[PDB]
Write a protein that holds these residues in place. Structure first.
Motif, PDB file in Angstrom:
ATOM      1  N   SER A   4       0.816  -1.210   0.000  1.00 28.93           N
ATOM      2  CA  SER A   4       0.000   0.000   0.000  1.00 28.93           C
ATOM      3  C   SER A   4       0.853   1.264   0.000  1.00 28.93           C
ATOM      4  O   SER A   4       0.412   2.317  -0.447  1.00 28.93           O
ATOM      5  N   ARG A  22     -14.305   5.006  -8.635  1.00 29.36           N
ATOM      6  CA  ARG A  22     -13.171   5.136  -7.741  1.00 29.36           C
ATOM      7  C   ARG A  22     -12.752   3.800  -7.122  1.00 29.36           C
ATOM      8  O   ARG A  22     -11.560   3.568  -6.933  1.00 29.36           O
ATOM      9  N   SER A  26      -9.059   1.937  -6.874  1.00 23.04           N
ATOM     10  CA  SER A  26      -8.567   1.433  -5.597  1.00 23.04           C
ATOM     11  C   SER A  26      -8.105  -0.010  -5.724  1.00 23.04           C
ATOM     12  O   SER A  26      -6.999  -0.352  -5.336  1.00 23.04           O
ATOM     13  N   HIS A  31      -4.953   4.182  -6.764  1.00 25.93           N
ATOM     14  CA  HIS A  31      -5.307   5.149  -5.735  1.00 25.93           C
ATOM     15  C   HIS A  31      -6.171   4.439  -4.705  1.00 25.93           C
ATOM     16  O   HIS A  31      -7.360   4.232  -4.927  1.00 25.93           O
ATOM     17  N   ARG A  32      -5.565   4.065  -3.586  1.00 30.44           N
ATOM     18  CA  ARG A  32      -6.218   3.168  -2.634  1.00 30.44           C
ATOM     19  C   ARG A  32      -7.471   3.729  -1.956  1.00 30.44           C
ATOM     20  O   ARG A  32      -8.458   3.011  -1.861  1.00 30.44           O
ATOM     21  N   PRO A  33      -7.452   4.999  -1.486  1.00 36.17           N
ATOM     22  CA  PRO A  33      -8.684   5.474  -0.840  1.00 36.17           C
ATOM     23  C   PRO A  33      -9.863   5.526  -1.810  1.00 36.17           C
ATOM     24  O   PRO A  33      -9.686   5.948  -2.949  1.00 36.17           O
ATOM     25  N   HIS A  34     -11.039   5.097  -1.352  1.00 34.26           N
ATOM     26  CA  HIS A  34     -12.265   5.109  -2.152  1.00 34.26           C
ATOM     27  C   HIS A  34     -12.856   6.504  -2.265  1.00 34.26           C
ATOM     28  O   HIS A  34     -13.578   6.808  -3.211  1.00 34.26           O
ATOM     29  N   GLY A  36     -11.198   9.654  -0.251  1.00 37.67           N
ATOM     30  CA  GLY A  36     -10.098  10.592  -0.133  1.00 37.67           C
ATOM     31  C   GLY A  36      -9.398  10.907  -1.441  1.00 37.67           C
ATOM     32  O   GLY A  36      -9.276  10.049  -2.314  1.00 37.67           O
ATOM     33  N   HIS A  39      -3.681   9.791  -1.144  1.00 41.06           N
ATOM     34  CA  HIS A  39      -3.230   8.648  -0.354  1.00 41.06           C
ATOM     35  C   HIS A  39      -1.815   8.882   0.130  1.00 41.06           C
ATOM     36  O   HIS A  39      -0.899   9.040  -0.674  1.00 41.06           O
ATOM     37  N   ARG A  41       1.047   8.834   3.969  1.00 33.98           N
ATOM     38  CA  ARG A  41       1.319   8.674   5.383  1.00 33.98           C
ATOM     39  C   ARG A  41       2.078   9.901   5.873  1.00 33.98           C
ATOM     40  O   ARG A  41       3.104  10.288   5.296  1.00 33.98           O
ATOM     41  N   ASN A  79      -1.454  15.427   8.856  1.00 34.04           N
ATOM     42  CA  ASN A  79      -2.053  14.294   8.159  1.00 34.04           C
ATOM     43  C   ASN A  79      -1.652  14.235   6.682  1.00 34.04           C
ATOM     44  O   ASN A  79      -0.468  14.266   6.376  1.00 34.04           O
ATOM     45  N   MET A  80      -2.632  14.159   5.780  1.00 33.72           N
ATOM     46  CA  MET A  80      -2.350  13.974   4.359  1.00 33.72           C
ATOM     47  C   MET A  80      -1.708  15.207   3.724  1.00 33.72           C
ATOM     48  O   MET A  80      -0.934  15.087   2.771  1.00 33.72           O
TER      49      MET A  80
END
Lengths: 189, 197
Positions: A4, A22, A26, A31-34, A36, A39, A41, A79-80
DNA sequence: CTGGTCCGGATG
DNA sequence: CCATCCGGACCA
């Protein structure tokens, strides 16, 4: 699969790849978030983002575009938003932002343009979500949003990809050669 | 004043209260959706519904009426497919005091034990109902789902989910002598939006 | 920076 | 009548 926290292109998924929804983007790992738009950390960096026309004051020239953080009170470099800033080749600054020293030395971001971005961008696809390749954060800074009125964190992204962009003659020829088409979910009406 | 998932009457809004437009009914909290006929959550129940003559085969006796689910069809369209006991339709069925049955429907054991539904009659319902108001949207009080069942619509030939609603409210109904006197006593009149030309 | 749903309302 | 625009609130 890739983890991820994979930086860079997804193996087997060329620039120009296009999905209706979306969740497909994912599942492909692009693009992992459905939901957001970013993505990442917050103490690593950002792996991918989605251009869907969420902020009316954003601009897009294909090779370069501005992008807005998330979070109607003021945004913060946490955060993001923090994650995306860490991609910039420069010290982290949560007061005035920063400009990259060697922009290409920044960490790569996968960029997905949504058809919803058509209302602010001439480069958005007509349908679905299109993988447009690797971009890098040239700089980032806080500013009062022209259209929303509160403080946001803004970013300048610049393309840095060996794969030709989908809107170029070369990109268009490649999409055709590879028969890239809008992909609907398995078993769709 | 109350949360969006509030069951029962809205505080301060008596039976007989009337608003010109759906958005006013929404802002008052009486019927939150601006367009949809049913307000509910599919795994909780339904809080309110609007009677606006959308289905030609519905009937209305005031104390009781039949009502139709949504779906089977733009914010409004022509009917084209079968309805299903899902979303708002499912929510309304959950108000019935009976196990949920999406094949043949169900009939309440103790109809008054069902969850309350706020009922708003629209002037648009006059094309099927003698009890609809002349103008605007009138809050007519609390009803309960006696039973519900699937059937082919007499007016468009696709399956609809149908509901029998029965009134259960201490406030007298607006069309009764008593309710008429109360509306006069409370000076209840058709309310237009603030600053309406 | 989803997606499906929808018993409005204005307009011509 | 009717067809079309408009593009919000709500929930899964």
């Amino acid at each position: 699969i890739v983890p991820s926290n994979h930086y860079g292109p997804i193996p087997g998924i060329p620039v120009g790849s296009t999905w209706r929804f979306r969740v497909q983007v994912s599942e492909a790992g692009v693009h992992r978030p459905h939901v957001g738009g970013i993505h990442g950390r917050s103490n690593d960096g950002a792996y991918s983002l989605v251009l869907a026309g969420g902020f009316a004051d954003e601009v897009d020239r294909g090779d370069e575009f501005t992008y807005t953080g998330s979070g109607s009170a003021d945004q913060t470099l946490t955060n993001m938003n923090r994650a995306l800033a860490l991609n910039c080749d420069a010290p982290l600054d949560d007061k005035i932002g920063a400009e990259s020293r060697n922009w290409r030395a920044g960490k790569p971001v996968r960029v997905i343009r949504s058809f919803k971005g058509r209302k602010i961008s001439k480069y958005a696809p007509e349908e679905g979500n299109r993988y447009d390749g690797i971009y890098k954060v040239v700089k980032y800074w806080p500013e009062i949003s022209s259209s929303h009125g509160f403080l946001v964190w803004r970013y300048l992204l610049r393309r840095d990809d060996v794969e030709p962009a989908p809107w170029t003659s070369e990109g268009i020829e490649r999409s055709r050669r590879l028969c890239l088409r809008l992909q609907y979910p398995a078993g769709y009406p």
